[PDB]
Structures are given as structure tokens and as C-alpha cells.
Design an enzyme around this catalytic site. Structure first.
Site, PDB file in Angstrom:
ATOM      1  CB  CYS B 385      43.635  43.717  48.195  1.00  0.00           C
ATOM      2  SG  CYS B 385      42.738  43.733  49.759  1.00  0.00           S
ATOM      3  CG  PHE B 386      40.215  41.472  46.303  1.00  0.00           C
ATOM      4  CD1 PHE B 386      39.638  41.026  47.479  1.00  0.00           C
ATOM      5  CD2 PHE B 386      40.061  42.801  45.947  1.00  0.00           C
ATOM      6  CE1 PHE B 386      38.930  41.887  48.289  1.00  0.00           C
ATOM      7  CE2 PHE B 386      39.354  43.668  46.751  1.00  0.00           C
ATOM      8  CZ  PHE B 386      38.788  43.212  47.925  1.00  0.00           C
TER       9      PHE B 386
END
Lengths: 74, 412
Positions: B385-386
Site C-alpha cells: 500500500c505504501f
């Protein structure tokens, strides 16, 4: 005898079956080494789709006969 | 947006750090302060300079602006093909045009990566490889075996256009002619090259030599399905018309068009519809086939310097042992091992044309980042996600390299 099953990727797998085995038995042998549900399996022989209930004797399938596997959708 | 600092004021950092800027408008990041003069990049590709120009024009258009809101997609990672088929074909194009919110059911861009590997699986008889060595995909004419395929092409088209719409890249290699067909361009013998090399060789030979005595062709073409050959007429009563040096040029024209476009006219139509629902025909044609290919697939060539230069650190320093080893280990790996490391951390193996500075995260531009977390006994974890990797501070090179190679293997 021994039969051959060709996939649409160009690969072929060897399978051992007698000319009296059912089609669903052939599919379960495919899943046994390919992990593909007999449900999604489409077995084509000489441009004709096979039926689970029938056997190899119905389609006079001899040795070294190449069957073509295709996946269903929904 | 806070205003300026009162005259005489100044900002400082508790720890040594370098500050970069994130443009959420164009979805890019840079080292240069937008409030400061920034010179142009010298020595840059004239083909990328224009592609750069074209994309700016493209994305900043009425039909290419996200409709405020959010489209929710929920699928099981072990059945993403059927699950995505429902979630996508249920929602209308307008709903797909609003910000994507993908979630995986079971555990609660990697979605596009996983989906690509399934949509273009020859097993489904939708797409097929070109020959058997180079695995560039083209449409399988025998798709008729599944009466549902016409919807699946419209769906595959949707995903392709959807990916383009939301900066998402697809991990698939279309044949050259397929990019021209999406731009609705004309296809010639040159394009038969990538589509079918065997046919290309033969057709090209006919135009360079006499055939009268050496060949006995008719105006027909035979394609074999499931170990059974089926022949088709190129023109009415084609299989009954002899091919001579007089009409050989006509034969070549007809065959190429068949083998490429006419052979899949129906499937490509369904596909081209789904793609147009998201990416309007009249604005795609701004790009050529080479530029369109990048806009869909992106770059698979990983550069270490670009990678290293645009990496963030949470709790680490670039000069730290573990980090120094990390890049030594990365440098020694090949392009496949590196792309495998990316898949592990970001979820995809593709990279924006501009580089790692524009690496995309779930909520926008997210630079590759290495966080200092986890015990030395554990394997490295990753927050896709990051674009982040939880790297335990290993005290020796070998162990790090081993734990690292293992984690990227565990996730396959």
C-alpha cells in the site's frame, strides 16, 4: 494404455488410462498433477467435446491419442 | 495550504533529511521546489519529450478527469478472475471512472498485476501466445468454445482502459499490430512480423519470387483448432480459385488482413468496446503504437541508480550497513530478480516512464521506502500500500541476502 493431453500453452502431459475409463476419471488424473478442478475442464478429442458420463470406448480413443484441454468460464 | 512563515522565521529538522515535493495534481514528485526556478532537463529523448507532452494533454481532459467519489471492488485473491468479472461487469463505466477502492476478501496495482496474469492465460482460450518461445499475446480465434467470451473481451477491454485511466500498468505484451488496431490504424505486411513469423516469412517470399511452378495455393486459409484444421475462403469461392503470379499480390493483401484483423473481428470488437467505455476513441489516437504501449504496459527495465536515488528511509540512513548491503545485493541481481523484489514491495513489476520519482502508491505518488522494523530472526515484510519494506537490521550480509531472497520467494 498411455494418452497425451495438450494445453493451449503448447505443453503436453502424459496420462495413463485404459480404454474403459470414464472421462471424469481422466479429468481427476489431470487435476492430480495440474491442480485444475474437473469442473472447469473441457476435454476435446478430434474437435469434439467429451461427456463425463461416457468412457474412452465410446469415442474409440486409442493409444498416443492427443486430447485438448480448455478451461470454462462462468 | 499554509501561507509563508513570518519574516525572520526558519524551519529546521531534528534529524538529517532531504525534502522533496509531491504534486498530487499530475501525480509526480520532484527534488525541485515549484516556488523556485527550475531549468529544463538537457539531453532528453525527443520521443519522450513529445510523449511527455502528449500525456499532459491527454490526462488533462474532460473525459479523463476522475469523478469525485469512490468505486469499491472486493475480490478473493485465489479467485480474482471470476470475482473481478462480476465486480466490474456489474458497475457502469461512470462508476468505474471514480477513484478506485480495491480490497481483497479473505484476509483483509497489485490487483491489476494479478488480474493480467489471469486474463491473458492461454488456458482460458481468450488470448494465446505468439508461437512458442516469445510469449507476446494475441487474440485466440477459437475463443468461441466458451459462449461467454464476448463479455470477457468487453471485460478485458474495460480493465485495460481502466488501468490506463488510473495510472495503473498491465503486465502483458501485446503484438505490434494490436496497438495499431486500438488506434484504428491500417495494418500491413510489416505487422505480420510480430503476429505470426511463419506466415510473414512465407508471404514475404512469394512477393520476391515466382510461384507459378513451385506453389499450388488457392484463395483460402486454414486454421487448426483442437487438432482439427478448418479452412476459410479469403474471397467468395476462394478455395476453388488458383493463385498465380498475376493475383499473388491480391492473395497476400487478403491473407494478412484475415490472419490479423478479419480473423478476430468479432472478439476484437467486444474488446474494443470495453476499452472505449473508459478511453474515448477520439483521444487515444493522439498517441502512436509505441507511445500507447508505454501508456498501458510501462517500463519493465529496472535501473539501480534511479531506484536508489528515489528511495525513502524510515529509521535508516543510506549510509547504514544494512542499506549499503541492500544495494550491493540488489546490484548483483539480474533484471528478473529485481523485478521480483518490486512485485514483493509494490505489487507490480512495471515502472512509470519518468522513473522511480513518479512511483505510484495507493493514494498517490509513493516513493520506494525502506523502514527499520522487525527482529533479526524474522523475514522482511512489506506494505505494498505504501511501497514500503519492513527491513530488520541484520548484522551480516549473507543473512540479509538469504532472508531477502526467501521473502520474495514466499510471496511468489
Amino acid at each position: 494404455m498411455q494418452i497425451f493431453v495438450k494445453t493451449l500453452t503448447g505443453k503436453t502431459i502424459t496420462l495413463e488410462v485404459e480404454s474403459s475409463d470414464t472421462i471424469d476419471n481422466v479429468k481427476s488424473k489431470i487435476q492430480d498433477k495440474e491442480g485444475i478442478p474437473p469442473d472447469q475442464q473441457r476435454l476435446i478429442f478430434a474437435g469434439k467435446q467429451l461427456e463425463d458420463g461416457r468412457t474412452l470406448s465410446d469415442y474409440n480413443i486409442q493409444k498416443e491419442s492427443t486430447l485438448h484441454l480448455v478451461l470454462r468460464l462462468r | 495550504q499554509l501561507g509563508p512563515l513570518p519574516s525572520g522565521w526558519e524551519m529546521r529538522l531534528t534529524n538529517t533529511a532531504r525534502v522533496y515535493f509531491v504534486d498530487h495534481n499530475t501525480k509526480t514528485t520532484t527534488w525541485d521546489d515549484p516556488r523556485l526556478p527550475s531549468s529544463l532537463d538537457q539531453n532528453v529523448p525527443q520521443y519522450k519529450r513529445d510523449f511527455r507532452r502528449k500525456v499532459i494533454y491527454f490526462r488533462s481532459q474532460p473525459a479523463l478527469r476522475i469523478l469525485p467519489g469512490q468505486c469499491h471492488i472486493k475480490v478473493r485473491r485465489k479467485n480474482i478472475f471470476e470475482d473481478a468479472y462480476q465486480e466490474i461487469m456489474r458497475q457502469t463505466p461512470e462508476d468505474l471512472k471514480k477513484r478506485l477502492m480495491i480490497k481483497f476478501d479473505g484476509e483483509e496495482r497489485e490487483f491489476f498485476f494479478l488480474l493480467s496474469h489471469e486474463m491473458f492465460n492461454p488456458f482460458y482460450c481468450l488470448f494465446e501466445y505468439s508461437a512458442y518461445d516469445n510469449y507476446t499475446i494475441q487474440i485466440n480465434p477459437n475463443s468461441g468454445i466458451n459462449p461467454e467470451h464476448l463479455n470477457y473481451f468487453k471485460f478485458i477491454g474495460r480493465v485495460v482502459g481502466l488501468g490506463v485511466f488510473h495510472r495503473r500498468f498491465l503486465d502483458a505484451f501485446f503484438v505490434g499490430a494490436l496497438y495499431k488496431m486500438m488506434l484504428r490504424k491500417k495494418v500491413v505486411l510489416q505487422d505480420m512480423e510480430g503476429v505470426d513469423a511463419e506466415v510473414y516469412n512465407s508471404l514475404n517470399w512469394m512477393l520476391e519470387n515466382s510461384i507459378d511452378g513451385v506453389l499450388d495455393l488457392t484463395f483460402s486459409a486454414d486454421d487448426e483448432r483442437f487438432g482439427e484444421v478448418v479452412t476459410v475462403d479469403l474471397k467468395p469461392d476462394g478455395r476453388n480459385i488458383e493463385v498465380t503470379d498475376g493475383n499473388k499480390k491480391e492473395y497476400v493483401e487478403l491473407y494478412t488482413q484475415w490472419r490479423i484483423v478479419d480473423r478476430v473481428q468479432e472478439q476484437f470488437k467486444a474488446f474494443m468496446d470495453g476499452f472505449n467505455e473508459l478511453i474515448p476513441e477520439d483521444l487515444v489516437t493522439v498517441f502512436d503504437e509505441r507511445e500507447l504501449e508505454l501508456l498501458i504496459g510501462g517500463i519493465a527495465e529496472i535501473d539501480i541508480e534511479d531506484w536508489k536515488k528515489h528511495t525513502d528511509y524510515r529509521g535508516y540512513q543510506e549510509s547504514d550497513e544494512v542499506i549499503q548491503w541492500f544495494w550491493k545485493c540488489v546490484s548483483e541481481w539480474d533484471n528478473e530478480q529485481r523485478a521480483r523484489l518490486l512485485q514483493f514491495t509494490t505489487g507490480t513489476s512495471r515502472i512509470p516512464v519518468n522513473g522511480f520519482k513518479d512511483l505510484q502508491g495507493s493514494d498517490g505518488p509513493r516513493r520506494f521506502t525502506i523502514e527499520k522494523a522487525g527482529e533479526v530472526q524474522q523475514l522482511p515484510k512489506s506494505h505494498t500500500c505504501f511501497n514500503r519494506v519492513d527491513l530488520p537490521q541484520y548484522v551480516d550480509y549473507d543473512s540479509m541476502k538469504q532472508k531477502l531472497t526467501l521473502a520474495v520467494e514466499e510471496t511468489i
